[PDB]
Design a protein around this ligand. Sequence first.
Ligand SMILES: [Cu+2]
Ligand SMILES: [Cu+2]
Ligand SMILES: [Cu+2]
Length: 439
Amino acid sequence: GPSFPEPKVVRSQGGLLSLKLSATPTPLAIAGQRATLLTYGGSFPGPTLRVRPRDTVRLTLENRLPEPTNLHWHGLPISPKVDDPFLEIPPGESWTYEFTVPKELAGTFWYHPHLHGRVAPQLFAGLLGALVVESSLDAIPELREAEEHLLVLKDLALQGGRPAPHTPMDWMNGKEGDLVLVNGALRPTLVAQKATLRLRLLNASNARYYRLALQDHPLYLIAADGGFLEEPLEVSELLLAPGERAEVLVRLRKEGRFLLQALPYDRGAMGMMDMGGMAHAMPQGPSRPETLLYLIAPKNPKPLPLPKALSPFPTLPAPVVTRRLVLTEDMMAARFFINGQVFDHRRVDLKGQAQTVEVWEVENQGDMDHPFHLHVHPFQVLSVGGRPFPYRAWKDVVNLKAGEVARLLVPLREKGRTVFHCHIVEHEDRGMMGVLEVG
Ligand SMILES: [Cu+2]
Ligand SMILES: [Cu+2]
Ligand SMILES: [Cu+2]
């Protein structure tokens, strides 16, 4: 097949994407070995769904797992009666998700389980896939003529031909694997045919971070989690926390081989040490560097000019309330809290008003990085750690290092009951989640 593996794409037809997926244990070949993973549609990653604004999506999920499951349409501003974080599909049963893609929407989104207490093992085992919303902006020459690829960044560990089980330390840290894969492949080669690449990036890992850097090249950020930036932003590296997405343009500068790497990054994961009676927690330190793929540039590359503008960011109404959400940890108990509480599906934690704007101040008072995710209502990051954000774009995950405060502008869209949580999904399963009701 093609040198660069990417998930199979399913496109809407005549305004309708109608599809049956099964969640199923699936034998397959992965990184040169045979393993049984949990997949959607028989593949790892699951199929990429590619739609346009105002399309109808009709997705029937059949549960062929031994435990209940559901779907979270991560990043999609739709109703929480569709993107329902409390729904359980029992083993053997099916459920049809039907929604209309919002008119003002573009970017890379994804789907994965969200059944509280079971997310981390199900996602680690392989249950995830991407959803791409095409834009009329994709027709401007500087994007249309680029070579486009999706990169699903997800790691894995195998034991006895199956995903490795979670240990107690995994529930504390979030589980990372030794197989650091791109689209389920081990260090694939991308032989570029054009000098400009448009790369859609998705961190679908449980807990691993990707401090992205391409050898000898900057990256040009053109989209965040849930939409385009207003104009391209040149960066020397790009950190992608669990659940985040980004789109970048790569402008290949000369012939040759360039490594795309995940550079060392210390997210605050912990180990245990005994040095003379004391048996106490100790920082794991930064991750070891990983090569994600080999990028081969074509002959005499002459990249396209960058687009001068992308999409103007909406002017938001003035906000009507400020919220403060504080994250804390009990590492040795593997318990995680928001404003001193663990998740309770019966307890509403915040009550807001549809079509108003709120300011959310999220403060990480723990020692680990925590990537904070809000369902249903995309937000604008104003600042993190007291530093103003260098662009305007819709996001739905924001990473917080130890001590940092994020100030978010949160327009409330669809009415109903939804959730916010850490997207180190082990921390969500262990309690770091709360309930927002919009009325
Ligand atoms: Cu998610
Ligand atoms: Cu969620
Ligand atoms: Cu967390």
